[PDB]
């Protein structure tokens, strides 16, 4: 019989079936800020357009003319952010109304929604946050560290309280793709350059602690190999024991000498880290210990964008073919998998009780 798997795959959609041209399925033209929408910039005739796919009604996409170089949908609402060099505009689509506009000093080269109501803007020189509340304008958070100069910016994220900020770029150095991160502390107003490829923050409440710890998790393929780090940022909430830092290996098989991490999402429902590699591997790690639960190759196709999958507290992504795919914990299998296949009853029992999962009645 087929081995039980600790994760479940699910294909949601094939974008080519909605008549999206594969030429436009890629990092610069297709954005997925949340699991609620996908926006694709396309040129049909001489007219530039955006295609907005509502994931609750995906067979009826809307197409609208644009003149923007980038389009990103709010994570929760049909509110779109558009830009053209320095010119930023926010529209409420259903109201057909321009909510907000701003012209920056410098071109915005990367931007992303970091919350329901705040957009982060990256220029060649700095990072700003722009709240949609009231008449708020963009506020500069920090100046970019020289170690990200010349990098392609691929991600920006924050902790839940927006006190720890993380900018990630990549470049080619000595024939490998090297990740450069800038971690910034809002409270200290200090940056630290870190070599890393993909990361996420997470809230985690250690047994015995009254308050959640804020954890920084990142994966890197360095010169000396793959590593995953899980570390508390900042002084522990008063009362708390500190979270002991974890550093574990990230395996790459000998035939994947050029692979590296591209995406990370953390389930706080299951306290697991999902890591996806450039050339299509999925890894699952326990957030508490860093133990590797599972690795498999989804396929040969690069998954270039991901988001949290809210329904399953998993990860949803798009690959270059336009397959929209999710991975989540298989709640009925994960505990017996850990016990029987990994032969790790210790981890199995902990996860069973920690995350209220069945299966540890036996081992």
């Amino acid at each position: 019989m087929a081995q039980i798997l600790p994760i479940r795959f699910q294909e949601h959609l094939q974008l080519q079936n909605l008549g999206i041209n594969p030429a436009n399925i890629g990092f610069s033209t297709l954005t997925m800020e949340s699991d609620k929408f996908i926006c694709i910039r396309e040129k049909v005739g001489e007219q530039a357009q955006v295609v907005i796919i509502d994931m609750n009604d995906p067979s009826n996409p809307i197409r609208r003319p644009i003149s923007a170089d980038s389009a990103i949908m709010n994570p929760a609402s049909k509110v779109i952010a558009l830009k053209a060099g320095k010119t930023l505009q926010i529209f409420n689509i259903e109201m057909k109304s321009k909510m907000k506009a701003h012209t920056m000093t410098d071109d915005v080269t990367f931007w992303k929604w970091i919350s329901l109501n705040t957009v982060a803007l990256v220029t060649d020189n700095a990072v700003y946050h722009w709240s949609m509340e009231g008449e708020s304008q963009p506020v500069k958070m920090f100046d970019r560290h020289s170690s990200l100069a010349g990098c392609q910016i691929i991600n920006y994220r924050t902790d839940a309280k927006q006190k720890w900020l993380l900018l990630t770029g990549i470049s080619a150095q000595q024939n490998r793709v090297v990740g450069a991160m800038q971690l910034y502390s809002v409270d200290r107003k200090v940056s630290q350059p870190i070599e890393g490829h993909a990361a996420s923050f997470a809230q985690f409440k250690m047994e015995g602690n009254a308050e959640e710890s804020t954890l920084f998790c990142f994966a890197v393929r360095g010169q000396a190999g793959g590593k995953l780090h899980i570390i508390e940022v900042g002084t522990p909430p008063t009362g708390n024991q500190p979270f002991p830092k974890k550093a574990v290996d990230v395996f790459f098989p000998p035939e994947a000498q050029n692979d590296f991490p591209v995406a990370m999402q953390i389930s706080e429902k299951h306290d697991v880290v999902f890591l996806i590699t450039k050339y299509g591997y999925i890894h699952l790690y326990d957030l508490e210990t860093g133990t590797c639960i599972y690795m498999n190759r989804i396929s040969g196709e690069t998954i270039f964008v991901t988001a949290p999958h809210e329904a399953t507290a998993g990860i949803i992504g798009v690959n270059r073919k336009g397959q929209v795919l999710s991975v989540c914990v298989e709640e009925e299998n994960i505990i017996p998998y850990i016990t029987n296949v990994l032969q790790n009853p210790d981890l199995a029992l902990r996860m069973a009780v920690r995350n209220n999962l069945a299966g540890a009645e036996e081992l």
């Binding site: 502390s185 200290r188 200090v190 940056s191 630290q192 940022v233 830092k245």
Partner: peptide
């Protein structure tokens, strides 16, 4: 720096 000690 020294935000975190890896």
């Amino acid at each position: 720096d020294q935000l975190i000690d890896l």
